[PDB]
Amino acid sequence: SMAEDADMRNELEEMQRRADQLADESLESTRRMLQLVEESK
């Protein structure tokens, strides 16, 4: 009388890597491009 094994509930897909600061950096460059393009006119 030993509770038999149980099937692994399932998989809950969840993926997180290095986006935060990589895209914040990406942004800081576009802003400066915009400023320069504005300045030229």
Binding site: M15, R17, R18, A19, L22, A23, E25, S26, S29, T30, R32, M33, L36, V37, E39, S40
Partner: peptide, 27 residues
């Protein structure tokens, strides 16, 4: 995912070159 973020960095790679070109035109 690792591949997705590698691709995002690859996409960002061109932003610096474009910024340099625009600053060149501004100068």
């Amino acid at each position: 995912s690792k591949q997705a973020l590698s691709e995002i960095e690859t996409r960002h790679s061109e932003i610096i070159k474009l910024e340099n070109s625009i600053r060149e035109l501004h100068d």
